[PDB]
Amino acid sequence: KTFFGQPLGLSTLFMTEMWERFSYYGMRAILLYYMWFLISTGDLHITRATAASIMAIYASMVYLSGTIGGFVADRIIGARPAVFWGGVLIMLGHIVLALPFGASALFGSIILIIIGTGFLKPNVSTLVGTLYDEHDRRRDAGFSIFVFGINLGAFIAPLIVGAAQEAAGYHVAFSLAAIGMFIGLLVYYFGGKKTLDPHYLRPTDPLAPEEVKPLLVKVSLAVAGFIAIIVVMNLVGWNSLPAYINLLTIVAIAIPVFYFAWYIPLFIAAVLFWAIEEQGSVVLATFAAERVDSSWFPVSWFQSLNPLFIMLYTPFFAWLWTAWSSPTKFAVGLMFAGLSFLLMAIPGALYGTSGKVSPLWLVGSWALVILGEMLISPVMMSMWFLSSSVGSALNAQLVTLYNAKSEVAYFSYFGLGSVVLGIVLVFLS
Numbered sequence: 001k002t003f004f005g006q007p008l009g010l011s012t013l014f015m016t017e018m019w020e021r022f023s024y025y026g027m028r029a030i031l032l033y034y035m036w037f038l039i040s041t042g043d044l045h046i047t048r049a050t051a052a053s054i055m056a057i058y059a060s061m062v063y064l065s066g067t068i069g070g071f072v073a074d075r076i077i078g079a080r081p082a083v084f085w086g087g088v089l090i091m092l093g094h095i096v097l098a099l100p101f102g103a104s105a106l107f108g109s110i111i112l113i114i115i116g117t118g119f120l121k122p123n124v125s126t127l128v129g130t131l132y133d134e135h136d137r138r139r140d141a142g143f144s145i146f147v148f149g150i151n152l153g154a155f156i157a158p159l160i161v162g163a164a165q166e167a168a169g170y171h172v173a174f175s176l177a178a179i180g181m182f183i184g185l186l187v188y189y190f191g192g193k194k195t196l197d198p199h200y201l202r203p204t205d206p207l208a209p210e211e212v213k214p215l216l217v218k219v220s221l222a223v224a225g226f227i228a229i230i231v232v233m234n235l236v237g238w239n240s241l242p243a244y245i246n247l248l249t250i251v252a253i254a255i256p257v258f259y260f261a262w263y264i265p266l267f268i269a270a271v272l273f274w275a276i277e278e279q280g281s282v283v284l285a286t287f288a289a290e291r292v293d294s295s296w297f298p299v300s301w302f303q304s305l306n307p308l309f310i311m312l313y314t315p316f317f318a319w320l321w322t323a324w325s326s327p328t329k330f331a332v333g334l335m336f337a338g339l340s341f342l343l344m345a346i347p348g349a350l351y352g353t354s355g356k357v358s359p360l361w362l363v364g365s366w367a368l369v370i371l372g373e374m375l376i377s378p379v380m381m382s383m384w385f386l387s388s389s390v391g392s393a394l395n396a397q398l399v400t401l402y403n404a405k406s407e408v409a410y411f412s413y414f415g416l417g418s419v420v421l422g423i424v425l426v427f428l429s
């Protein structure tokens with residue numbers, strides 16, 4: 001009695017992440033459109049460029065938060081309660097958007113989700129490994145099934161939430177995301193008791209008595225330093241929303257710069273790929289709503305194409321690895337990400353940017369970037385959240401450059417630059 005050949009505990013962790021990814025991507029599939037709506041009603045006083053910049057820096061902070069989440073669970077609270085309380089905060093984040101608020105609830109929702117995802121995301125993957133004794137062949141297979149559940153929830157979420165939004169408005173749609181996380185917590189709590197090791201109800205590497213004080217000093221200096229900057233920024237007048245976004249961008253990018261100051265192309269190639277891939281929920285989401293002949297279905301459903309192609313490619317790629325150079329899998333994967341943007345430059349160049357084009361352009365675009373991602377994933381998970389975070393931090397600046405007038409050039413330059421650097425890697429490798 002197994003779960004696809006794996007310990008039964010995988011089933012609990014499978015579903016738990018599926019429903020968290022459901023709540024997360026269901027929210028993101030309509031959040032940008034929700035901000036557009038708040039702007040159009042005059043409730044939210046920002047530009048569409050800023051709203052899209054917020055989408056990118058949001059994702060950046062979510063993964064940056066995931067970089068330290070493992071530490072807090074391993075040393076302080078425990079992996080199991082970290083997942084639970086992380087899920088609680090996430091559920092609360094979606095509840096906030098379900099309340100009859102407008103722009104006033106956005107910041108609170110963002111913070112709750114960032115902190116919550118930071119506790120849950122790295123620790124649920126940690127718990128997956130705990131199912132396996134140290135040297136097991138099943139381990140690789142078990143994680144792969146786990147990734148499938150992640151993309152499963154990411155697939156059905158834009159379909160369900162997006163349709164719900166179209167029918168019953170935004171607040172109801174955000175509530176379904178909250179319900180999704182609630183389902184995950186239910187399964188996780190009761191399913192976890194049956195299987196999961198009681199060992200991870202407590203931290204596995206608890207702080208030694210002499211470790212507490214220097215840790216306290218470290219976090220206090222950082223918070224004080226971060227507070228000092230914000231204070232200084234306000235005195236000089238750099239206190240607009242884009243000014244804060246810039247600060248977060250600088251912070252997110254400074255961290256790896258310093259980490260290395262204390263693999264470089266491999267990390268850069270990862271950052272650039274994730275930047276392109278993460279723009280599917282921002283730039284491609286904008287393009288879908290403005291340039292696509294899609295009047296017979298919710299435009300938010302385009303967000304399902306990314307996890308759809310992942311689920312479609314994985315059985316094929318499972319062959320390739322058994323059918324027959326780690327840096328080269330980054331070199332080519334980045335070229336495919338660049339080709340996906342080059343493809344998007346075509347309909348605007350051929351038909352102009354004023355009208356509407358086929359949805360098949362987006363399908364082809366995602367088909368290429370996911371093809372790139374298939375090479376990326378097989379090639380320190382805290383660093384995995386880091387390259388992802390910087391890529392999104394880069395997006396927070398680049399994404400603002402995108403509009404109907406600049407569409408063709410935007411896709412062309414970043415499409416070409418990505419391919420070139422993929423070839424630059426070919427020469428270096």
Ligand SMILES: CCCCCCC/C=C\CCCCCC(=O)OC[C@@H](O)CO
Nearest residue numbers: 080081084185186188189190192193196
């Ligand atoms: C919210 C929906 C789930 C039902 C929970 C009911 C109990 C209320 C509060 C319990 C909080 C304690 C946290 C439990 C925990 O660390 O999670 C471990 C899980 O694997 C099983 O214990």
Ligand SMILES: CCCCCCC/C=C\CCCCCC(=O)OC[C@@H](O)CO
Nearest residue numbers: 238242243244246247250251254255258
């Ligand atoms: C290890 C991490 C430490 C690195 C932190 C470095 C931060 C130093 C300075 C950041 C403040 C500048 C960002 C704010 C800003 O310029 O806003 C833009 C403003 O011109 C918009 O009108």
Ligand SMILES: CCCCCCC/C=C\CCCCCC(=O)OC[C@@H](O)CO
Nearest residue numbers: 342343345346347348349350351352408
């Ligand atoms: C690997 C080869 C696959 C085929 C791809 C070749 C096509 C790539 C780019 C061609 C774009 C043509 C679209 C029309 C165009 O650019 O004309 C614009 C300009 O002449 C009019 O103002």
Ligand SMILES: CCCCCCC/C=C\CCCCCC(=O)OC[C@@H](O)CO
Nearest residue numbers: 343347357358360361364365367368371
């Ligand atoms: C691994 C798969 C690679 C994907 C290749 C990229 C696909 C190339 C072109 C896709 C869309 C072509 C247009 C189809 C169409 O029906 O045109 C209608 C018209 O409205 C065009 O805008």
Ligand SMILES: CCCCCCC/C=C\CCCCCC(=O)OC[C@H](O)CO
Nearest residue numbers: 068071072076206207208209212216219
């Ligand atoms: C590298 C990221 C650090 C961020 C963590 C945020 C938490 C800040 C302070 C929490 C530390 C307090 C925990 C101390 C503790 O419970 O252990 C002391 C006992 O001697 C051991 O059980």
Ligand SMILES: CCCCCCC/C=C\CCCCCC(=O)OC[C@H](O)CO
Nearest residue numbers: 339342343345346348349350408409412
């Ligand atoms: C085999 C995979 C897909 C192949 C993708 C190849 C596409 C490469 C470039 C496409 C777009 C070329 C640029 C067009 C351009 O800048 O013209 C300007 C427009 O006339 C208006 O700005």
Ligand SMILES: N[C@@H](Cc1ccccc1)C(=O)O
Nearest residue numbers: 021063150151154384385388
């Ligand atoms: N699509 C990925 C996003 C991600 C990238 C990198 C690290 C962590 C998460 C997921 O849901 O898991």
